[PDB]
Design a protein around this ligand. Structure first.
Ligand code: NA
Ligand code: NA
Lengths: 96, 100
């Protein structure tokens, strides 16, 4: 099982997403801070909490923010997001 | 070099993006309709020009608006997307992200 670390202040979205992922293919850890101490195949992380592969969650679009994330090698999703969207992005990313 | 196919009815964004790409690393083609015909490393396609029946088996789809079902549908078909607003800098960095 691929290891997925999900970092955010709030956890509803992430709990629901975890319930949606196949438990034989993905194992989730949830945090309120990006602990670079934890090994993970993919980190999903709120932008405000950003210090492996990382998918960044943004509240709003901003060109310079977006350009910098992509140059650093991070894909991003801009709100609004749903558990189904986040589950599908995690699957797509890990399978690719 | 990598091959990027660009499918759109409004070519200005794409024109400006090619100008920013290093021509020794990337060769571009731009069209108004989606051709499975061409082999490319990455396809950037406007959603309105994306055939409904296709999926993969890189494709980046460009959306005007957010719609949840549409976003879930694209990701399940194996396509990443970008919602507007979009700029040439954003497009260039995305292309490089995928192909690096
Ligand atoms: Na499921
Ligand atoms: Na699960």
């Amino acid at each position: 099982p691929k290891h997925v670390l999900l970092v955010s202040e709030h956890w509803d979205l992430f709990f629901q997403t975890k319930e949606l992922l196949n438990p034989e293919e993905y194992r989730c850890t949830i945090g309120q801070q990006y602990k670079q101490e934890l090994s993970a195949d993919l980190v999903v992380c709120e932008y405000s909490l950003l210090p492996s592969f990382v998918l960044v969650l943004l509240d709003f679009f901003d060109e310079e923010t977006s350009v910098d994330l992509l140059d650093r090698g991070f894909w991003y999703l801009i709100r609004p997001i749903t558990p189904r969207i986040l589950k599908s992005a995690i699957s797509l990313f890990l399978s690719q």
